[PDB]
């Protein structure tokens, strides 16, 4: 994973996202959704999804939320106050903690001013607590600004490392982007059905035909502009549509 003071930032893009494999995986110790409850994720579409990744202690997962304070949310990773995404977290004691102490996971514990939301700060200047200038050397009131979790496998819970992923769905002003995986099911002809091909919605009885579209043509319509044929998007076969008897 990535440190807590320099988190990563992956920009998921145009794709088919299935938040159900996430939501039901039962391997996550924390799955909170803020802008939007979890079950309705596989039914919406946004412009961009960002995924941020890092590693923190066990009892610091309550500062990854909109409107908190503490050494993590103050100056390591700040979430805006109208967050939209979801926060996922799971314990990772066996991967990240090693006997003798894993001193490779640092965090920032001194900064001049709290972070703006989604702001990032990887500098390593000597902090200056008191009024006396520091001149790049340590000493009283001149502190190195980074500390390291010394993780060890015999730590009580709440001191073992947790890995965190923060998904943030954003909606700029584009034309569209990633959305869930629209469902589908087998077909059935020679019966009055409610069909739906890609968004073409109607009802009637579907038979096989003797038309020949052009490779780019997706459905046919007649005079008076009613749909009387269609192409189905998996067989590449065109089907006649006939209204279901009435009188």
């Amino acid at each position, epitope marked *: 994973f990535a440190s807590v003071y320099a988190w990563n930032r992956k920009r998921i893009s145009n794709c088919v996202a299935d938040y159900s494999v996430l939501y039901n995986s039962a391997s996550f110790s924390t799955f909170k959704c803020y802008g939007v409850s979890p079950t309705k994720l596989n039914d919406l579409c946004f412009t961009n999804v960002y995924a941020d990744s890092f590693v923190i*202690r066990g*009892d610091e997962v309550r500062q990854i939320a909109p409107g908190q*304070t*503490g*050494k993590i949310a*103050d100056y390591n990773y700040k979430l805006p106050d109208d967050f939209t995404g979801c926060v996922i977290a799971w314990n990772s004691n066996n991967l990240d903690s090693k006997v003798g*102490g*894993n*001193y490779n996971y640092l965090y920032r*514990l001194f900064r001049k001013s709290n972070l703006k939301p989604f702001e990032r700060d990887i500098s390593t200047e000597i902090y200056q*607590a*008191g009024s006396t200038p520091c001149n790049g050397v*340590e000493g*009283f*009131n001149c*502190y*190195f600004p980074l*500390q*390291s*979790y*010394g*993780f*060890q496998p015999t*730590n*009580g819970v*709440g*001191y073992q490392p947790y890995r965190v992923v923060v998904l943030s769905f954003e909606l700029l002003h584009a034309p569209a982007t990633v959305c869930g995986p629209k469902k589908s099911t087998n077909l059935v002809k020679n019966k009055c059905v409610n069909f739906n091909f890609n968004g073409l919605t109607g009802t009637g009885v579907l038979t096989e035909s003797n038309k020949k579209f052009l490779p780019f043509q997706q459905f046919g319509r007649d005079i008076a502009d009613t749909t009387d044929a269609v192409r189905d998007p998996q067989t590449l076969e065109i089907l006649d549509i006939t209204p279901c008897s009435f009188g």
Partner: antibody
Amino acid sequence: QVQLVESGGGVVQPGRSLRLSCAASGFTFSSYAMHWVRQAPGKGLEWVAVISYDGSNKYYADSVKGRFTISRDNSKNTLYLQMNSLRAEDTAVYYCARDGQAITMVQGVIGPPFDYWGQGTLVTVSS
Amino acid sequence: DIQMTQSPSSLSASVGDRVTITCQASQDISNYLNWYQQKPGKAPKLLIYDASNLETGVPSRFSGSGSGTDFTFTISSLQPEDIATYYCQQYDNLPYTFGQGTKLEIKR
């Protein structure tokens, strides 16, 4: 398991010198930190001194400096506070406690501070 | 670097109530502290790490609230064996200052 024992205090005249003993048990001693804290009888607690995992990082308090010194034995899981130039005023009960969360001190943050398994007093009169 | 904390010291209430102790912190904002109880004739004892999140053993009648420069210990549902002092230690510098204590007394 984790418990501490202390000895070395008694009655002595002012101006003299005395060293204490703060021993450990159970856990690994040379990874933690060790604090020194006191209270004059009938008053509140007061932090006295601290040292890292034998890394020579004292950062003493006010007045205390130049009169106190810290020495721990990582090989024998013991810790000694030696004080010189007494004032006939620092007569108190004294406690040593473990830390795992300081900044320029012990590597990595581990557990809670100040788990407080000590005791032991020292009288400084003329009787 | 000199800081100090305060306390509404020397309170008194009865069995089954709620008490509050407010350690207001000095300048140079900090980040969580602690809460110790001290039964007299003995050694102190940890109850809550920085801000909140008590430890083990504690009968879970205790709560903190850490928001910068003013922290409030809050105990609910008093019990007839929980009268002692209560000194809070603040950390994040060279000199780890303390509070002043809070003596507790029943009602007769």
